[PDB]
Amino acid sequence: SPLERRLKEHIIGQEGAINTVASAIRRKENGWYDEEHPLVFLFLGSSGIGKTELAKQVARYMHGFIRMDMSEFQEKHEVALTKQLKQSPSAVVLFDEVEKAHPDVLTVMLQLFDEGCKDAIFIMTSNAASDEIAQHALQLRQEAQEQSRRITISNTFKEQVIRPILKAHFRRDEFLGRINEIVYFLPFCHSELLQLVSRELHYWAKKAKQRHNITLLWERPVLELLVKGYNLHYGARSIKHEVERRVVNQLAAAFEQELLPKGCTLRLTVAPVLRLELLQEDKTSRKLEIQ
Amino acid sequence: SPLERRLKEHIIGQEGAINTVASAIRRKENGWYDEEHPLVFLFLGSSGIGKTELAKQVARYMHGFIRMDMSEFQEKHEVAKFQLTKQLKQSPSAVVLFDEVEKAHPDVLTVMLQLFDEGRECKDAIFIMTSNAASDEIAQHALQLRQEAQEQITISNTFKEQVIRPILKAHFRRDEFLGRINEIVYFLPFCHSELLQLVSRELHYWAKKAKQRHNITLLWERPVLELLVKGYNLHYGARSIKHEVERRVVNQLAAAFEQELLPKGCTLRLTVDAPVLRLELLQEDKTSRKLEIQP
Amino acid sequence: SPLERRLKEHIIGQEGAINTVASAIRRKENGWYDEEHPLVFLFLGSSGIGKTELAKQVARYMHGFIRMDMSEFQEKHEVAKFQLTKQLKQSPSAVVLFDEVEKAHPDVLTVMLQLFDEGRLTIECKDAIFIMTSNAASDEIAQHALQLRQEAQEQSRRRITISNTFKEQVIRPILKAHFRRDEFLGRINEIVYFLPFCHSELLQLVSRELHYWAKKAKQRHNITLLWERPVLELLVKGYNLHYGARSIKHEVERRVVNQLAAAFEQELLPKGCTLRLTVDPVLRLELLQEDKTSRKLEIQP
């Protein structure tokens, strides 16, 4: 769908997720879904790997966005959205941390999904079965890598392993039955980590040339070296930190030591240490000593 | 090896387990294990799929068998009791099986560890500790590995180190313990073929008994087998199908026998016609036809 | 002292400790400790880095060894149980090791203190050695050791004894807080420090085990086992702080000896062979061909 390809052009990775979301939406548009009812997605996966940003991008494509935290609403006191939906009837709404919600917020939610604000999209994000998803993901990765030596999410895996987990977590068959699509977010593969680092280094190169006319270039071992500082626990922004803490610090230091005049060509190359190389009028390069 | 062949000839399925265990044992004999220490195996997997009898058969091959329950030792006073010394007295070089090892005291495992490192004289005993650790990750990994085989049996190394080492290090919290373990032996859930072999074994027993006392020749066909293997429940294992066989076949045999339907020297063939099991009787017509058993 | 050197020749690393223990022993046996009293050592350090073996070898030198766990004796009924008096009745002048005295009940430590200062239980226990082992200030000792190693290697780039000031201004507080009795700490003859192994000593550990295996391989299967130093460091790369020396044992037994076992069952190792471990990071087992070449062996499961 056009939607599928512009999300594909603004999000790194998660092609399963993107396909399911886009195709479900245009399934609704083709009328194979109740025209009078809003869509219900359940984003299963690990943290910080594109859920909130995917939601923000579909929201951006069709308009306009609302976000809420369910840990705030885990008992009746907080159980006791309508304002934000009064502002926008047809908007993408993101319920985060649903696994920690109170069952009558889940009844209020269910009847809201059934009565419908009919042209809105409802995305619920959970940390359910994320480690089964993870272990399945790596078995798949190894199986895919053994095949190359010689990712689709399996259906039997969903019904026999993940259905018990969800049924146990939510206690309501009416709820799981209500859900239009369970969207899976798989962990990043090596290539996409590479894409992340490349994105950040591009940002820094862009502003560097924009303010100080510094031309920043790099080579692939730089990218892999940086990709080796990826943290699973908080995800994509992990690598952003690492860049900003092993590349940009040296750029800053070298800048304040007056090693980087305007109009330079600076290329990063590579316990493997990252070497910062400057282009001379010798049309050759040499490594900067930053002390 | 002869030990390997005899484990393969008395236990159904679990060839991974047999190989791992046998290969570790003759690894010791060759002389590539510390020769003054008893071996330590950790039995991971699900219940009732061959652990205790694999132990029993190693015991049977080399001899003399001891079994203890760790769930019993969930108190510090029972740690001071950990009859074990009396058991190692009658036989020092014996297979010793610790069940429910995950539910054990830190003091109990320190004492265990001290047997393992010292052999306080038990230098030729085999120590098998069986646990319910990571059983659902093991179960799921095996299920997806079975799916790969269907699309087209080994436990992956990255799987053990990046998945099962965390679970174990968490369940035992003492690295010298896991380090001490000679081998972590994996018991995978039965695949269909093994279920078929199980049912066939039971039916074989009953056929044997039938010809033995009432001279009844019992025969069957494979749809009988699959009909019966669908009466397997994962919760207890082999005796699930044992029970199922006795609850869909021999009950019918018993009933038909009591109603004067099964003479001596008779030939009875089970077949399948909710698919119901039919008992076809061989007539002097040299043809056969279903028996009608009154409720 | 001869005793110090023999400890040095059966124990790897920990020379500070050996120095203190031996020197205390011959300080008393010159006559500069009260002679009617047994010695009290307090082994401060990390786990599995030589304490129990040092005690065991001192015991071996002078004979005869007794070992008790204080974690067992942490309340009053257990204080009535504190037994020691029986095993000490068997041998009066023996090395006795109290483990985890950190976790003792304050008056099983008064019973202990009175044993130390009276040297009698009648059971005369003079000329006995009493070693108390604790996990006190182990993270301060560890962190001080690490900045010591670093400043030493910094000095080496420009071209380990523990400071007394560190003891008094940092760990004396830790100990005082842990034991809340000044007569107890005051009673202690020597506080023996056990430092974490340094790289050289880890290397010696791996080399020791590989020697054991070379010995057994040549003993029964007439296999000559050889290696090179990158093998040694490859193996020390898997050392675990948490339980110490046997970590290294485990690893040699589980990255080297397993392959010897595998290659042996596949008939790759006949009698009279020369097998040399190298590093290619993968460990490679080179078998000596009669073509004056050491080809790598391929092992198939």
Notes on the protein architecture:
The structure is cut from a larger assembly and holds 3 copies of chain A. Chain A has 291 residues and is α/β, with parallel strands linked by helices. In chain A, 53% of the residues lie in helices and 16% in strands. Chain A is built from 13 helices and 9 strands. In chain A, the strands form 2 sheets. In chain A, strands 2-3-4-1-5 form a 5-stranded parallel sheet. A 4-stranded mixed sheet of chain A has the order 6-7-8-9. In chain A, helix 10 crosses helix 12. The longest helix of chain A is centred in the C-terminal third of the chain and has 23 residues. Chain A is elongated and about 75 Å long. Chain A starts with a helix and ends with a strand. At the B-C interface, helix 2 and helix 9 of B face helix 10, helix 12 and helix 13 of C. Chain A: It is found in: Mitochondrion intermembrane space. Chain A: Belongs to the ClpA/ClpB family. Chain A: This is Mitochondrial disaggregase.
